[PDB]
Design an enzyme around this catalytic site. Structure first.
Site, PDB file in Angstrom:
ATOM      1  N   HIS A 220      -9.962 109.759 -21.786  1.00 28.67           N
ATOM      2  CA  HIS A 220      -8.518 109.891 -21.749  1.00 28.67           C
ATOM      3  C   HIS A 220      -8.001 110.529 -23.039  1.00 28.67           C
ATOM      4  O   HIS A 220      -7.142 111.412 -23.008  1.00 28.67           O
ATOM      5  CB  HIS A 220      -7.854 108.532 -21.526  1.00 28.67           C
TER       6      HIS A 220
ATOM      7  N   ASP B 289     -12.138 110.123 -17.513  1.00 23.85           N
ATOM      8  CA  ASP B 289     -10.961 109.343 -17.890  1.00 23.85           C
ATOM      9  C   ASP B 289     -10.964 107.931 -17.293  1.00 23.85           C
ATOM     10  O   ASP B 289     -10.852 107.758 -16.079  1.00 23.85           O
ATOM     11  CB  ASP B 289      -9.693 110.096 -17.479  1.00 23.85           C
TER      12      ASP B 289
ATOM     13  N   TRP C  14       1.517 106.686 -24.301  1.00 18.78           N
ATOM     14  CA  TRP C  14       1.829 105.288 -24.585  1.00 18.78           C
ATOM     15  C   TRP C  14       1.198 104.822 -25.897  1.00 18.78           C
ATOM     16  O   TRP C  14       0.047 105.141 -26.186  1.00 18.78           O
ATOM     17  CB  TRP C  14       1.299 104.438 -23.425  1.00 18.78           C
TER      18      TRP C  14
ATOM     19  N   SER D  23      -0.574 111.916 -21.042  1.00 17.08           N
ATOM     20  CA  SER D  23      -0.524 110.587 -20.414  1.00 17.08           C
ATOM     21  C   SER D  23       0.869 110.277 -19.843  1.00 17.08           C
ATOM     22  O   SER D  23       1.353 111.006 -18.978  1.00 17.08           O
ATOM     23  CB  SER D  23      -0.995 109.513 -21.404  1.00 17.08           C
ATOM     24  N   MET D  24       1.521 109.214 -20.311  1.00 14.48           N
ATOM     25  CA  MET D  24       2.856 108.891 -19.789  1.00 14.48           C
ATOM     26  C   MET D  24       3.885 109.957 -20.173  1.00 14.48           C
ATOM     27  O   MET D  24       4.952 110.055 -19.560  1.00 14.48           O
ATOM     28  CB  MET D  24       3.327 107.494 -20.219  1.00 14.48           C
TER      29      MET D  24
END
Lengths: 271, 271, 271
Positions: free
Chosen positions: A251, A222, A28, A94-95
């Protein structure tokens, strides 16, 4: 480079080097530049690396519609078809772990040799009736509220917990500046729509359809995507998946743990 | 504007005004925007000005291959023939002095009316066995090592010695911010490849092929590209070349000595 | 998306949502991104929103010529015809109030349902023989001299009076950073030419050709475009025009008074 998606959306991508293909899917707010060090590392070591800017991000067009995982997955399918890639290793952060997984679920794994999930939202991020351990949806509702007021300052504030700077990680002002610069390129609409997508999309069905060698990497420090309810579970639900945990890593570990990641990716490809 | 190089690389350029053409080649890290003040100055005074973003930089595509001076020179050749330019005055800054010189070496000077070399790496930057006075290659090896860890912060740190801020020069926060913004657009791969290119490429043969009026300008406070072993020598090796030394000027003198540079370019054109 | 203007200039634009169209024209230095919040607000409420980057700004090409209101207006006309827009509500901010007004004056209002002028330069910004109350032209001459020395720092310094930060308005560093980032994308030439355009162009004749419902909004704390000699007069000169004054609001009130603006636009569309 560019290709045009079904709905007319022009998507930017980089295609570097030669050899077996490794296709990267960013997280993202960011874009293909988040992978620049992994791409240079692998392409100077015999691999072809490909990375796109997700619709609504970086140098890609900013459509009002299609900001959802089914469309994201089909975008990847179109890129793979465009380049006629075979034996591709999919890598998502991530996403971006979501759309590479959804790609396999929707299109199968005939063109896929392997999968890597880095600090990914898989198999599920937000709360569901049978997943109360997920992140409460009102957390994401607040993301949206703040983004619709001042997304620029939201991004700036996001740097600290993203990189774990508030917990002792060291990241230069330069990286923080580049992160913000790239994020500002993105569409406000896409940025907010993505929150809906990653907050509420259930990838558990997807996990059962992943029939290729898979490597899951996650930092147990994270602050953004909780290891315990994502990476830890994805590694169990995917048959034969390998799991690597970076101790206390944040993260944004592609930055803080770049060399370690580079080496783990190469070792996975050489397996 | 854009044109597509032979290998498919899309190159961005600006083509302003009318009259005799002046074509600008930017230095490392920057793009065509570094020339904006010289372009406005000259095009407001009866000249046509053209400036491109080198492959891998600014708004241009980021190819994995072709990041070398022969290719850079051929890109320039394509631009010139693209627009069918005649009696063009070539102006190169820093590493950009190299590709305009190499263009003449490879393609001849039929379309060229004059040459200007600003703080240029010509005739040779790094050490050779017969050029121990050059910059030791391990200096450039270190550049690469730092760039492959954190290029964003490298760029930021580079601002000081680049503009001579560490040595009595005054440059606004705005300029430093714009410099970083532009540099971040560039490819990590192109950025590193260019170091190899300007570190090790020998332009001494090129100097003997330059048969047009030439003006060499260099700051004698240049911390990046040493006047004594570059500009000073280029002015001697190029038959009939004129040399102007800006007293105490830093490397980035297009910013710090803009007006003086503008007037010197105009005077050269009107010679 | 992009379209190509008469003279070859490629113009970037966004076209979001569906329903009655609302077309936005941004102010000096900015681009289509300044409207992101208004676009998301209205397009999530049943409207189609369109916003372009003016030639020379943002993601559009940077022509040396055509940086004047007649050309700006014809660019808008070409976009409207390109998309075959009907019953469109034109919304202009600052200098962008000028090109939507000039579009109507040059092309008529057959395709136009309404007009909104936000902190606009209309009906006239600079002094004329019969308008000594306007801004003296030496003020704009000074803009140009400063821009031609260091436009990056000019933009940075402009943030304060633009947003009214020097008078109690609270604006995040993020917003100020995004403002600078977008402005730096623009052409130096376009940036300077626009000063000439908004400083000296008389839109009083245009006011008499506006035969559609019109809403004028202006902050009476505007340090950039004086309410008393612009917005206040425009509302009087345009037949049937409605006037809303945001108390103590700055010039950049789309940021400081975003929610109020959003609601006022919706209310205007629903009348």
């Amino acid at each position: 480079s560019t290709f045009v998606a079904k709905d007319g959306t022009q998507i930017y991508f980089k295609d570097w080097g030669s050899g077996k293909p490794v296709l990267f899917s960013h997280g993202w707010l960011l874009d293909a530049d988040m992978w620049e060090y992994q791409m240079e590392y692998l392409s100077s070591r015999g691999y072809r690396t490909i990375a796109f800017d997700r619709r609504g991000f970086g140098r890609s067009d900013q459509p009002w519609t299609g900001n959802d995982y089914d469309t994201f997955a089909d975008d990847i399918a179109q890129l793979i078809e465009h380049l006629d890639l075979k034996e591709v290793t999919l890598v998502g952060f991530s996403m971006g772990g979501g759309d590479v997984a959804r790609y396999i679920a929707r299109h199968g794994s005939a063109r896929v040799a392997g999968l890597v999930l880095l600090g990914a939202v898989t198999p599920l991020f937000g709360q569901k009736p049978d997943y109360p351990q997920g992140v409460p949806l009102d957390v994401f509702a607040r993301f949206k509220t703040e983004l619709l007021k001042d997304r620029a300052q939201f991004i700036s504030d996001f740097n600290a917990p993203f990189y774990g700077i508030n917990k002792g990680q060291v990241v230069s002002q330069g990286v923080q500046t580049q992160t913000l610069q790239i994020a500002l390129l993105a569409s406000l609409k896409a940025t907010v729509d993505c929150v809906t997508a990653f907050a509420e999309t259930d990838f558990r069905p997807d996990m059962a359809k992943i029939d290729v060698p898979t490597l899951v990497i996650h930092g147990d420090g994270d602050q953004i995507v909780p290891f315990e309810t994502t990476g830890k579970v994805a590694a169990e639900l995917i048959k034969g998946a390998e799991l690597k945990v970076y101790k206390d890593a944040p993260h944004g570990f592609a930055v803080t743990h770049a060399q370690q990641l580079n080496e783990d990716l190469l070792a996975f490809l050489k397996r």
